[PDB]
Amino acid sequence: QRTPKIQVYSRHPAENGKSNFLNCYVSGFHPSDIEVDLLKNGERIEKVEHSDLSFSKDWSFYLLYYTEFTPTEKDEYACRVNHVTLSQPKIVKWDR
Amino acid sequence: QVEQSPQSLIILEGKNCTLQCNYTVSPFSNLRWYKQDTGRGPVSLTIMTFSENTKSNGRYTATLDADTKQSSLHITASQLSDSASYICVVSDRGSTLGRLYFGRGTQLTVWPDIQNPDPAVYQLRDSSVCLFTDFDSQTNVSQSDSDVYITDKCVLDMRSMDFKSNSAVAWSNKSDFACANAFNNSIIPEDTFF
Amino acid sequence: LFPLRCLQISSFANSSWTRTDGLAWLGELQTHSWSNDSDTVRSLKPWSQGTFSDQQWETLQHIFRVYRSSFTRDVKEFAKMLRLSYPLELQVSAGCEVHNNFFHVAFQGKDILSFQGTSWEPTQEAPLWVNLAIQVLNQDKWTRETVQWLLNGTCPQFVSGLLESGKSELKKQVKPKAWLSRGPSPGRLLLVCHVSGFYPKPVWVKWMTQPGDILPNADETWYLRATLDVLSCRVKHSSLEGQDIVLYW
Amino acid sequence: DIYQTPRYLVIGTGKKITLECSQTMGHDKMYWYQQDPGMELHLIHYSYGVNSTEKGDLSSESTVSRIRTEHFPLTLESARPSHTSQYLCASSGLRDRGLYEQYFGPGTRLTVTEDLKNVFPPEVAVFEPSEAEISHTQKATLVCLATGFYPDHVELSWWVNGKEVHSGVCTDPQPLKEQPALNDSRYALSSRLRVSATFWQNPRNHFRCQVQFYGLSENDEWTQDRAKPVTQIVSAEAWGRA
Ligand SMILES: CCCCCCCCCCCCCCCCCCCCCCCCCC(=O)N[C@@H](CO[C@H]1O[C@H](CO)C[C@H](O)[C@H]1O)[C@H](O)CCCCCCCCCCCCCCC
Ligand SMILES: *[C@@H]1O[C@H](CO)[C@@H](O)[C@H](O)[C@H]1NC(C)=O
Ligand SMILES: *[C@@H]1O[C@H](CO)[C@@H](O)[C@H](O)[C@H]1NC(C)=O
Ligand SMILES: [Mg+2]
């Protein structure tokens, strides 16, 4: 049925070298079976937390993934999501 | 999931009995007791939910203690027509969406309380066959050999004049059968007429 | 007003693989959690139990347990009868609010039924096979009486216990911070305004425009991102006693 | 309000069999149980309504059909000797209280044989009261005897002067096998009728013993010389002596 919307953002303004939080918020999808990854320089970050799966008034699902991280000039972060409605896994880069 | 006790039991007429039913079914909705005569369909006696501890249908009375998941069927003043198989079934939903769990049943035999016996063996003629009649219920009849046939013990009730009797019947294709040899394999009372 | 919403998600892969997970929100705050890999409903705040006793709460604990296993098997059996195909997704949204209640059920993400009055009724735009399900559900008198008691009596008495217990966290105020940036050009440009770290949820941000969605932070604070294609950015909030947050470009 | 026809059924090996069950109420939920003599009920099929036909807690080689609410036929594709048993139909619905009780049909007994030439109707004979019994108990016992029938599909009744009685009557709970060896053996069965010594010595009294036999039907094959062993009644009688 419904395909996911992906949004990447950060808890605090990103100053190079100071500690921050990296959020990925996937939403508006259905059914609930989904895979979601936070990527650092192209590789899956294995130490990530997430919120409990929940849904909105229109019965569609939504999720938040998050991890601590320290921005640097060279590091490139992103969020990968695969869902039955997708041809191939969708990837959204975090814009500095 | 559902157990009954005993497997079978034999009582005499005029006495009371109590049959058990134990279940581990969870969740519990209701419990029924059925009565099945030989070669017939089961007949509904009672149905109970957890909020009831007693129901009476004639001489039959079922109780249900939901807390220990047990119900007992109590037959008052037994008689020959209470001989049957008694089944107990539990349902885990209050709708047709449930599952029904059956016990293996309990077989109940009711014998006459033969107070004044008079055990004899007669020979009736065709229209030749030996008849073992009028003994008490502590006596059992054994089977046979191929050429000789012997029947199980059986109760008739002459209701009009208040009288019941046990009888059995034997016969054989051989032309040398005697009544003194008919019920040889069985234990016969020493005071049996000939 | 702070409605209490109890959410459930039950997923059925095949007839052997299934999962049921649940949660409860009090306003924007989430107060309970309940996973498939657990024999208990989990509390999250030090006031999650409200003004209910341990014996009272444990009784609730016993009802949900019986319900989760039964719901599962009722659905597998409904699958045969109705000849439905796997996979299957079912969702439930139940609760009340102190001034009325509700109990909606969805299948594959569309409404099918709900609990009105003392029984189950279909929804206006539902399939015919739902009539079969409604016909069976309405036979269970004890369950119908139990949902009434839960919504008409247990839930409203519970929510109050919470409100006089979580008055601090509910009437709490957190101040946001804000900053500007330059996104990807459409010789046009893109003026992006970032407002983050506020609580409670209701907010107001405009360019004085595409006011984005309100996105969650992991400490129950929120985040907002309004944009403009081409100047000042203004933020109002309860935490800011009238004194707005004006940032210039 | 739940019916099963026929009550008894003989059939040869390798042929098809259909078992009728019908109900005049409108209950959706229906069940088929199979029960071997002296044992438990096993669910073999059930239905939640028309076009619903689910296999039950037992793997049988049978199939069911629910094309009409009131009818739930059971069908054996190809009968084997191991399908000899008793088959009960049942249904669920709202009743006396606010709960959904289960109601059972009367049942059908099926015997599968290896060959139709194995089927024979019974022979019946009545034996007459002994003299010793009369001048010792002042009571006299009549004995009816049915032999040589197959299968064991038999209902016996006593008739005292053209009026069926039940008092002073006893009949065997199960027929016995004449030759306990052979897998296809014939059966015998005995019954007793006891009356007062006085009632027996009145020569206006006519005692008749009757056996109902359920055997072959109008559409079975038959290439033997002896008459078809169709469903029929066999008698044997006696008059009051002096
Ligand atoms: C909910 C308001 C109060 C909340 C207060 C607590 C606050 C904490 C909340 C914590 C979060 C909890 C997680 C989220 C929960 C979501 C809502 C769940 C609502 C639970 C209601 C409980 C139902 C109670 C009745 C019940 O358990 N009944 C079960 C046992 O019943 C059996 O056993 C009984 C003996 O106990 C006797 C009864 O006669 C017998 O039948 C029933 O088998 C369950 C059937 C209920 C399903 C109805 C709704 C879904 C509709 C069916 C799905 C559609 C199917 C078609 C598509 C495939
Ligand atoms: C059911 O689905 C689950 C999840 O994909 C899978 O792991 C399991 O093997 C499946 N079982 C069957 C019967 O296919
Ligand atoms: C969920 O819980 C059930 C019941 O405890 C369990 O059998 C099932 O395997 C679980 N499903 C999973 C592991 O996804
Ligand atoms: Mg109907």
Distance, CA of B155 to CA of D164 (rounded, Å) = 19
> Which residues in chain D (34-73) have CB-CB distances under 8 A to chain C?
48-49, 52, 54
Nearest to D103 by CA among B89, B51, C80: B89
CA C174 to chain CA mean position, Å: 22
User: What count of other Cβ atoms lies within 10 Å of the Cβ of residue D200?
Assistant: 21
Experimental method: X-ray
Please give the residue range of the domain that contains residue B158.
113-194
Contact C84, C96 (CB under 8 A): no
Complete DSSP assignment for C18-61: EEEEEEEEETTEEEEEE-TT-SSPEE-STTTTTT--HHHHHHHH
CATH code for the part of the protein at C1-171: 3.30.500.10
Report yes or no: A84 at the C interface, CB cutoff 8 Å: no
Q: Report how far residue A79's alpha carbon sits from residue A76's, in angstroms, rounded to the nearest whole number.
A: 11
SS3 string, chain D, reads CEEEECCEEEEECCCCEEEEEEECCCCCCEEEEEECCCCCCEEEEEECCCCCCEECCCCCCEEECCCECCECCEEECCCCHHHCEEEEEEEEEECCCCCEEEEECCCEEEEEECCHHHCECCEEEEEECCHHHHHHHCEEEEEEEEEEEECCCEEEEEEECCCECCCCEEECCCCEECCCCCCCCCEEEEEEEEEEHHHHCCCCCEEEEEEEECCECCCCCCCCCCCCCECEEEEEEEECCC
- Is D22 exposed, middle or buried, given 0-12, 13-18 or 19+ CB atoms closer than 10 A? middle
Structural tokens at position B183: 């019920």
Sign of the CA dihedral B115, B116, B121, B124? negative
Amino acid at B164: K
Q: Look at residues B79, B45, B40 and name the one whose alpha carbon lies nearest to residue B60.
A: B45
* Domain boundaries, given as residue ranges, for chain A: 1-96
User: CA-CA distance, C36 to D36, in Å (whole number)?
Assistant: 43
Q: CA D238, CA D126: separation in Å to the nearest integer?
A: 7
> Ramachandran region of residue D38, left (φ > 0), alpha (ψ -120 to 50) or beta?
left
- Label the pairing between strands B60-65 and B70-75: antiparallel
Distance CA(D168)–CA(D137), nearest Å, equals 15
What Rg do the C-alpha atoms of chain B give, in angstroms? Answer: 22
Residue B110: partners with Cβ closer than 8 Å, 6 or more residues away:
B10, B11, B12, B13, B78, B79, B80, B81, B82, B83
- Rounded Cα distance between B40 and D88, Å, is 9
CB B71 within 8 A of CB D7: no
Inter-chain Cβ pairs, chain C and chain D, closer than 8 A: 8
Q: Are residues B45 and B80 in the same domain?
A: yes
Phi first, then psi, for residue C151 (nearest 5°) are -90, -35
Instruction: Answer positive or negative: Cα dihedral of B172, B175, B179, B183.
Output: negative
What are the phi and psi torsion angles at C46 (to 5°)?
-65, -5
Residue B105 gets the label, from left (phi > 0), alpha (psi -120 to 50) or beta, of: left
Domain D115-240 sits in which CATH superfamily?
Answer: Immunoglobulins (2.60.40.10)
* Cα C67 to ligand 2 centroid, rounded to whole Å: 24
- One-letter amino acid for residue C218 of the chain: A
Count structural domains, chain B.
Answer: 2
The rounded Å distance from CA C37 to ligand 3 centre is 7
Pick from B45, B77, B112: which residue ends a domain?
B112
**Resolution in A, one decimal?**
2.9
Based on the fold, state whether residues B23 and B68 are members of the same structural domain.
yes
- In terms of domains, do B149 and B58 share one? no
Select from B80, B112, B144 the last residue of a domain.
Answer: B112
Please tell me the distance from the alpha carbon of residue C184 to that of residue A93, in angstroms, as a whole number: 13
Asked if C166 and C26 touch (Cβ cutoff 8 Å), the reply is yes
- Bridge partner residues of A82 (DSSP): A35
- Partner chains of D (3+ C-beta pairs under 8 Å): B, C
Q: Is the peptide bond before C216 cis (omega within 30 degrees of 0)?
A: no
Asked if residue B162 lies in contact with residue B171, where contact means CB atoms within 8 angstroms, the answer is no
CB contact under 8 A, B167 and D178: no
- Confirm whether residue C21 is marked as ligand binding: no
Same structural domain, B86 and B34: yes
**D182: amino acid identity, one letter:** L
- Contact D142/D126 with Cβ under 8 angstroms? yes
- In this structure, the number of other CB atoms found within 10 A of the CB of residue B40 comes to 15
Residues flanking ligand 1, CB < 6 Å: B 27, 29, 93-95; C 6-8, 22, 24, 32, 34, 41, 60, 63-64, 66-67, 70-71, 74-75, 78, 90, 92, 94-95, 105, 107, 133, 140, 142-143, 146-147, 150-151, 154-155, 158
Q: Rounded to an integer, what distance in angstroms lies between the CA atom of residue B142 and that of residue B136?
A: 15
Contact at CB, C109 and A25, closer than 8 angstroms:
no
Indicate if ligand 2 lies below 6 Å from the C-beta of C14.
yes
Q: Is C232 helix (H, G, I), strand (E, B) or coil?
A: strand
Instruction: Give the best residue of B92, B93, B96, B100 to mutate against chain C (max C CB count within 10 A).
Output: B93
Q: Is C74 helix (H, G, I), strand (E, B) or coil?
A: helix
C24-43 burial: b if 16+ Cβ within 10 Å, else e: bbbbebbbbbbeeeeeebee
Q: Where are the alpha helices (DSSP H) in chain C?
A: 54-81, 129-137, 141-149, 155-163, 167-170
Please say whether the beta carbons of B190 and B164 come within 8 A: no
Locus of tokens 């449930």: B98
Residue carrying structure tokens 């030749």: B128
Number of Cβ within a 10 Å radius of residue C126: 17
Residues B17, B54 within the same domain: yes
The structure tokens listed for C217 are 């932070």
DSSP state of C107: E
3-state SS class at C137: helix
Within its chain, how far is the Cα of D216 from the centroid?
A: 14
Give, in order, the Cα–Cα distances in Å from C58 to each of A52, C44, C49, C120, C186: 23, 16, 11, 27, 59
Name the fold adopted by C172-249. Immunoglobulin-like (2.60.40)
Task: Enumerate the domain spans of chain C.
Answer: 1-171, 172-249
Out of 2.30.140.10, 3.30.43.10, 2.60.40.10, 3.30.70.20, select the CATH number for domain A1-96: 2.60.40.10
Cα(C199)–Cα(A53) distance, integer angstroms: 21
CA C120 to chain centre: 22
Q: Which residues pair with C30 in a beta bridge?
A: C25
| Minimum-distance ligand 2 atom for the alpha carbon of C13 | 2
For residue C185, what are the CA distances in angstroms to A6, A42, C230? 20, 25, 9
Token reading at D101: 């009780």
Q: Is residue B124 within 8 Å of D128, Cβ to Cβ?
A: yes
| Token pair 């400490």: residue | C219
D92 CB burial (10 A radius; 0-12, 13-18, 19+): buried
For chain B, the farthest-separated pair of C-alpha atoms sits apart, in whole angstroms, at 68
Distance, in Å, from the CA atom of C98 to the CA atom of C104, rounded to the nearest integer, reads 18
Spell out a b/e string for B84-118, using b for 16 or more CB atoms within 10 Å of the CB, else e.
Answer: bbbbbbbbbbbbbbbebbbbebbbbebbbebeebe
CB contact set of D71 (below 8 Å; sequence gap of 6+):
D20, D21, D22
| Cβ C137 vs Cβ B95: under 8 Å | yes
Q: Distance between CA atoms of C107 and B43, rounded to whole angstroms?
A: 41
**Does residue B90 sit in the same domain as residue B3?**
yes
Three-class secondary structure assignment of chain A: CECCEEEEEECCCCCCCCCEEEEEEEEEEECCCEEEEEEECCEECCCCEECCCEECCCCCEEEEEEEEECCCCCCCEEEEEEECCCCCCEEEECCC
* Tokens linked to B174: 């051989």
* B151 phi/psi in degrees, rounded to 5: -90, 155
The residues pairing with B101 across neighbouring beta strands, listed in sequence order, are B90
How far is A24 from A7, CA to CA, in rounded Å?
6
Burial of residue D182, with CB atoms counted within 10 A of its CB: 0-12 exposed, 13-18 middle, 19 or more buried: exposed
Closest-lying ligand 2 atom to the alpha carbon of residue C15:
13
Can you tell me the distance from the alpha carbon of C36 to that of C69, in angstroms, rounded to the nearest whole number?
10
Task: List the structure tokens of C151.
Answer: 């919504």
Angular region, B116: left φ>0, alpha ψ -120 to 50, beta rest: beta
Strand D30-35 with A54-55, pairing: unpaired
CB C65 within 8 A of CB C59: no
Q: How far apart are CA D241 and CA D239, in angstroms?
A: 6
Q: Domain D1-114 maps to which CATH number in 2.40.110.10, 2.60.40.10, 3.40.50.1220, 3.30.750.24?
A: 2.60.40.10
Best C62, C66, C137, C140 residue to mutate vs chain B (most B CBs within 10 Å): C140
User: Position C16: which residue type?
Assistant: S
Q: In CATH, what number is assigned to the domain containing residue B102? A: 2.60.40.10
Contact in structure between B104 and B4 (CB atoms under 8 Å): yes
- C76 SS3 class: helix
The C-alpha angle C2, C4, C9, rounded to 5 degrees, equals 140
Looking up tokens 């009026």 gives D163
User: CATH 2.60.40.10 spans which residues of chain D?
Assistant: 1-114, 115-240
Ligand 3 within 6 A of CB of C36: yes
- D186/D176 Cα distance (integer angstroms): 9
Whole-angstrom distance, CA of residue C9 vs CA of residue D90: 37
